[PDB]
Amino acid sequence: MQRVHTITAVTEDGESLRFECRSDEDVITAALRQNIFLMSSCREGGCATCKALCSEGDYDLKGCSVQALPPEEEEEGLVLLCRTYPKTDLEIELPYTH
Ligand code: FES
């Protein structure tokens, strides 16, 4: 009936986790529902510093101020964990790294 999902998210800052979440994957919602409590940053789509990365999974990620900057070249640059869609996320790196 429902589709199960597994989010593997490791921060290049040095954190690494593999949780379970169905229907609504969302690395924040799933690990907020499992036991941990993460948080991207401002979620305003205007910093361009949180250059996160996406290993695999068809999940979605859309900037917030697209009318200031298109997220294409920024997507082909890397991925942003400020939006994070729960469509299908298999493995993702966090927005921090160093
Ligand atoms: S747009 Fe502000 S840290 Fe992501």
Curated annotation (Swiss-Prot):
Assembly mode? The soluble methane monooxygenase (sMMO) consists of four components A/MMOH (composed of alpha/MmoX, beta/MmoY and gamma/MmoZ), B/MMOB (MmoB), C/MMOR (MmoC) and D/MMOD (MmoD).
Q: Which domain of life is it from?
A: Bacteria
What does the entry list as the binding residues for [2Fe-2S] cluster?
C42, C47, C50, C82
Name the record gives this protein = Methane monooxygenase component C
Give the 2Fe-2S ferredoxin-type domain ranges. 5-98
Span of the entire protein shown here = 1 to 98 of 348
The role this protein plays is: Responsible for the initial oxygenation of methane to methanol in methanotrophs. It also catalyzes the monohydroxylation of a variety of unactivated alkenes, alicyclic, aromatic and heterocyclic compounds. The component C is the iron-sulfur flavoprotein of sMMO.
Query: What is the name of the gene encoding this protein?
Result: mmoC
